[PDB]
Scaffold this active site. Structure first.
Site, PDB file in Angstrom:
ATOM      1  N   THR A   1       3.047  -4.774  -2.239  1.00  0.00           N
ATOM      2  CA  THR A   1       3.467  -4.217  -0.964  1.00  0.00           C
ATOM      3  C   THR A   1       4.962  -3.884  -1.031  1.00  0.00           C
ATOM      4  OG1 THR A   1       3.322  -4.532   1.445  1.00  0.00           O
ATOM      5  CG2 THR A   1       3.891  -6.543   0.159  1.00  0.00           C
TER       6      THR A   1
ATOM      7  N   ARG B   1      -1.981  -9.616   4.460  1.00  0.00           N
ATOM      8  CA  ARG B   1      -3.298 -10.236   4.594  1.00  0.00           C
ATOM      9  C   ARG B   1      -4.057 -10.209   3.288  1.00  0.00           C
ATOM     10  NH1 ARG B   1      -0.553 -10.414   9.279  1.00  0.00           N
ATOM     11  NH2 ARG B   1      -1.947 -10.702  11.094  1.00  0.00           N
TER      12      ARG B   1
ATOM     13  N   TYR C   1      -2.076  -2.738  15.075  1.00  0.00           N
ATOM     14  CA  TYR C   1      -3.247  -3.474  15.556  1.00  0.00           C
ATOM     15  C   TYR C   1      -2.907  -4.662  16.422  1.00  0.00           C
ATOM     16  CZ  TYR C   1      -2.227  -6.350  11.391  1.00  0.00           C
ATOM     17  OH  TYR C   1      -1.642  -7.149  10.416  1.00  0.00           O
TER      18      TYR C   1
ATOM     19  N   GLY D   1       4.623  10.684  12.839  1.00  0.00           N
ATOM     20  CA  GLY D   1       5.666   9.974  12.118  1.00  0.00           C
ATOM     21  C   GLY D   1       5.887  10.522  10.718  1.00  0.00           C
TER      22      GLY D   1
ATOM     23  N   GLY E   1       7.608   5.641   5.672  1.00  0.00           N
ATOM     24  CA  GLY E   1       7.139   5.287   4.339  1.00  0.00           C
ATOM     25  C   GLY E   1       5.630   5.257   4.133  1.00  0.00           C
TER      26      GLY E   1
ATOM     27  N   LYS F   1       6.186  -0.665  -4.301  1.00  0.00           N
ATOM     28  CA  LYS F   1       5.116   0.248  -4.683  1.00  0.00           C
ATOM     29  C   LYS F   1       5.537   1.363  -5.658  1.00  0.00           C
ATOM     30  CE  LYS F   1       2.551  -0.635  -0.400  1.00  0.00           C
ATOM     31  NZ  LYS F   1       1.806  -0.005   0.787  1.00  0.00           N
TER      32      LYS F   1
END
Length: 268
Positions: free
Chosen positions: A66, A20, A217, A126, A129, A70
């Site tokens: 992203t 996004r 989400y 968790g 990554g 990274k």
């Protein structure tokens, strides 16, 4: 043909369709009165990233990075923030006034901004990554203890080590074990980094954590969020992580305060 000058930005990664970043940045630039700045998507492997960024001219002001780039971004940059070094990766490259590229990690802001505070005792659900940024963010929120709730003790131990290097107490709790109830009972907050269908198995067991930031989400509310809300708690979703990640990039690229309402309008 006299027109204002403009700058160029992009997101680098692969796959690059989900990000996004272009949306949130163009919404911000338009709100800031910079409608001719551009923000593109560039498909880019880790291996390709250093050559790609090295070739960019002075008009390039900033990059979002992203997966899978990274680590490469942190290695490429000739300057890096302390928090990017501590996370071990960078999702942001900013052009410096005299030519260099500075690496930062605003995934940390995603979590500190979305959660606000995490109290004294926080869980990370968790070990994948995105967990290192969550650990460093929780330490930056001043939590006293970070517990890694995960299945794999080996991956968890490396996050426990990171929590301790950040100054907090740390430890591992098997997500499938008998110790989870006690971890939840004393927790003030949690960041859940795992997929909704995986977290649903443990939603009832995690329900009593008072405030839960769920990285997921879509769809919303997740089973985890529903359980937390049914238990009287607060559930926050991953769009708020994306929002707060972007605020910090926009401010570094433009030098202007983030236009927060305009960016919220673009959030989804």
């Amino acid at each position: 043909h006299m027109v204002p000058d403009s700058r160029k930005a992009a997101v680098l990664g692969s796959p690059i369709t989900h990000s996004r970043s272009p949306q949130l940045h163009l919404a911000a630039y338009r709100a800031l009165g910079l409608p001719s700045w551009t923000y593109e998507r560039i498909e880019c492997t880790a291996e390709q990233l250093p050559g790609l960024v090295s070739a960019l001219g002075p008009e390039w002001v900033g990059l979002s990075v992203t997966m899978p780039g990274k680590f490469a971004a942190l290695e490429f940059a000739d300057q890096r923030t302390d928090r990017a070094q501590l996370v071990g990766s960078a999702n942001t490259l900013v052009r410096m006034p005299t030519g260099g590229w500075r690496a930062d990690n605003t995934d940390v802001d995603g979590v500190t901004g979305a959660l606000g505070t995490a109290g004294d005792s926080a869980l990370v659900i968790g070990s994948g990554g995105t967990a290192p940024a969550a650990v460093v963010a929780l330490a930056e929120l001043g939590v006293q203890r970070i517990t890694i709730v995960a299945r794999d003790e080996g991956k968890a131990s490396r996050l426990v080590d990171l929590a301790r290097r950040c100054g907090a107490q740390g430890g591992w709790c098997d997500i499938g074990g008998a110790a989870l109830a006690d971890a939840v009972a004393s927790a003030d907050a949690a960041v859940s980094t795992i997929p909704a269908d995986a977290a649903a198995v443990y939603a009832d067991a995690l329900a009593r954590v008072p405030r839960v930031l769920d990285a997921i989400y879509d769809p919303w509310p997740t089973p985890l969020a529903q359980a937390v809300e049914a238990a009287g708690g607060e559930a926050i979703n991953g769009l708020q992580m994306l929002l707060n990640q972007a605020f910090a990039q926009v401010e570094q690229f433009t030098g202007m305060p983030a236009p927060k309402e305009a960016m919220r309008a673009a959030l989804g």
